[PDB]
Design an enzyme around this catalytic site. Structure first.
Site, PDB file in Angstrom:
ATOM      1  N   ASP A  98      64.761 -84.732  62.824  1.00 39.03           N
ATOM      2  CA  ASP A  98      64.326 -83.742  61.823  1.00 39.03           C
ATOM      3  C   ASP A  98      63.121 -84.346  61.085  1.00 39.03           C
ATOM      4  O   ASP A  98      63.156 -84.637  59.870  1.00 39.03           O
ATOM      5  CB  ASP A  98      65.500 -83.506  60.856  1.00 39.03           C
ATOM      6  CG  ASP A  98      65.228 -82.415  59.837  1.00 39.03           C
ATOM      7  OD1 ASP A  98      64.150 -81.793  59.862  1.00 39.03           O
ATOM      8  OD2 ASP A  98      66.107 -82.203  58.969  1.00 39.03           O
TER       9      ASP A  98
ATOM     10  N   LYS B 156      60.099 -82.933  60.807  1.00 34.50           N
ATOM     11  CA  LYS B 156      59.279 -81.927  60.124  1.00 34.50           C
ATOM     12  C   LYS B 156      57.784 -82.284  60.198  1.00 34.50           C
ATOM     13  O   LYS B 156      57.108 -82.418  59.181  1.00 34.50           O
ATOM     14  CB  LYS B 156      59.689 -81.759  58.660  1.00 34.50           C
ATOM     15  CG  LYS B 156      61.180 -81.348  58.462  1.00 34.50           C
ATOM     16  CD  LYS B 156      61.444 -80.943  56.984  1.00 34.50           C
ATOM     17  CE  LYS B 156      62.731 -80.086  56.809  1.00 34.50           C
ATOM     18  NZ  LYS B 156      64.005 -80.776  57.293  1.00 34.50           N
TER      19      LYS B 156
ATOM     20  N   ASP C  87      51.290 -82.136  60.112  1.00 36.25           N
ATOM     21  CA  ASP C  87      49.909 -82.653  59.995  1.00 36.25           C
ATOM     22  C   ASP C  87      49.038 -81.917  61.021  1.00 36.25           C
ATOM     23  O   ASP C  87      49.521 -81.004  61.703  1.00 36.25           O
ATOM     24  CB  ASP C  87      49.910 -84.172  60.237  1.00 36.25           C
ATOM     25  CG  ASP C  87      48.849 -84.885  59.413  1.00 36.25           C
ATOM     26  OD1 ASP C  87      47.681 -84.440  59.472  1.00 36.25           O
ATOM     27  OD2 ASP C  87      49.198 -85.864  58.721  1.00 36.25           O
TER      28      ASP C  87
END
Ligand SMILES: Nc1nc(=O)n([C@@H]2O[C@H](COP(=O)(O)O)[C@@H](O)[C@H]2O)cc1O
Ligand SMILES: Nc1nc(=O)n([C@@H]2O[C@H](COP(=O)(O)O)[C@@H](O)[C@H]2O)cc1O
Lengths: 256, 256
Positions: B89, B91, B94
């Site tokens: 996880d 996430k 960028d």
């Protein structure tokens, strides 16, 4: 408009922002080097060589094939010697309970060496509340991502306004923004802008560039963040100097 | 509505989603354990004991104080033995050029051991394009964060709609969503929902909870992601079984 040196003295200035603004004025640099390299030795070589030209060194420590906390201890030595801040571009983006641990703990212990970090505002203000539980005791600051440079960015309109309000409401920890332009009229806040090169263009994965004159001079940002524009150049010292001179002269002209 | 077993056979189904759906059906579990611990020993003891109860084990590798790739090798062994997927996880949030290195490289080498990762859509679709350059030959899958559970989440309205569009357009790599409810009518996509507890409440940093019956039964999600509801129990095995039965029965109820 106030000089960086005067903004460093503002009553509501965060101590981290004040330190940064003072060294920007002292060294005549509003350039942040994006040290996007895979090896500790490269990160340290570039930090040492370009240290005099920069106000800030931005890391992605999760791309270092050979990270250790010793590498970061050595980076802090270079930061202190050359006078630049260390900004870990971690883009925290989880719930508050999680980001607190990702900031303080794990292998990287980011809060132990990064003067600044950044966060996305998409989770709601809990992301800031979590980070600040670690950040405030360690005298750190945080930048909120109000806009992105990349194609199809959703950080626009009401999302950007949300980031500004969140910053205002957490000014004991939030020192400003990652953005493409000035987004707040409060001079206590810093604006840092990535997606910067001298020439027009982009990459094949959504990055888009604007020049230092556009970003600092026309769009009213404070600091340019430059990666490949410097790192891919044959002479990285000359490149860093051209970017520093570009951003500094753009800032002087805006100042009048 | 199609069962998990039937959805595993859909023409446009991703191989990773197919493998997951098939084991969900075989094991009668739609529970993802959020293994939010800081010790490798605790992580592995949880994965071993709760492995038969879960379809997926979600990690935050950046919180593990004693991470090594050897720990991940041991986790993969348990994942193969007990039959569950590993979901980091992380996430990703960028620009595409950066997330590609964050996924493949650094100390974690996430792509080498994670069946699934997730990404925020805020940077535009370059975030998916970057990950997919790494994930596609490795037969990995990605979940896009369409909604968040936390107070003040900006992942709503047009933002959520953008996440769904981005998933549809990158269906070779994107296998579904992190969301609070069903957001796509396409049964090839998985919906995974965090912010789940049997009891009403939240935490002091913006987390909000809903029940498995609400999330699976009424909101039409596929899998519950459960952290503290299990981890904080004295007996984590009993707690995982409570969540497994809740989520599984809620799903059977929705089928009719
Ligand atoms: N909106 C943004 N745009 C960006 O380009 N960045 C980051 O700034 C660096 C980009 O400089 P360059 O793209 O190599 O020419 C890179 O480390 C990337 O992760 C970060 C943002 O928030
Ligand atoms: N929107 C989201 N909300 C969340 O709470 N999560 C993750 O899901 C987990 C929540 O666990 P918990 O049940 O609140 O302890 C935790 O690892 C957090 O990082 C992930 C999301 O995408």
């Amino acid at each position: 408009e106030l000089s960086f040196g005067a903004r460093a003295e503002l009553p509501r200035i965060h101590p981290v922002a004040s330190k940064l603004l003072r060294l920007m004025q002292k060294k005549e640099t509003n350039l942040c080097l994006s040290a996007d390299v895979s090896l500790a030795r490269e990160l340290l070589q570039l930090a040492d060589a370009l240290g005099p030209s920069i106000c800030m060194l931005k890391t992605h420590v999760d791309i270092l094939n050979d990270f250790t906390l010793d590498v970061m201890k050595e980076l802090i030595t270079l930061a202190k010697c050359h006078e630049f801040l260390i900004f870990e571009d971690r883009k925290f983006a989880d719930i508050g309970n999680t980001v607190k641990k990702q900031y303080e703990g794990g292998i990287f212990k980011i809060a132990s060496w990064a003067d600044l970090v950044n966060a996305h505002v998409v989770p709601g203000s809990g992301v800031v509340k979590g980070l600040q539980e670690v950040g405030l005791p360690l005298h750190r600051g945080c930048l909120l991502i109000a806009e992105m440079s990349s194609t199809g960015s959703l950080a626009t309109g009401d999302y950007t306004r949300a980031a500004v309000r969140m910053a205002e409401e957490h000014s004991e920890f939030v020192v400003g923004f990652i953005s493409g332009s000035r987004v707040s009229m409060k001079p206590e806040f810093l604006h840092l802008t990535p997606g910067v090169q001298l020439e027009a263009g982009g990459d094949n994965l959504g990055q888009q560039y604007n020049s230092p004159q556009e970003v600092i001079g026309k769009r009213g940002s404070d600091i340019i963040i430059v990666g490949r524009g410097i790192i891919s150049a044959a002479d990285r010292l000359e490149a860093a100097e051209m970017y520093r001179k570009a951003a500094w002269e753009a800032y002087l002209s805006r100042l009048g």
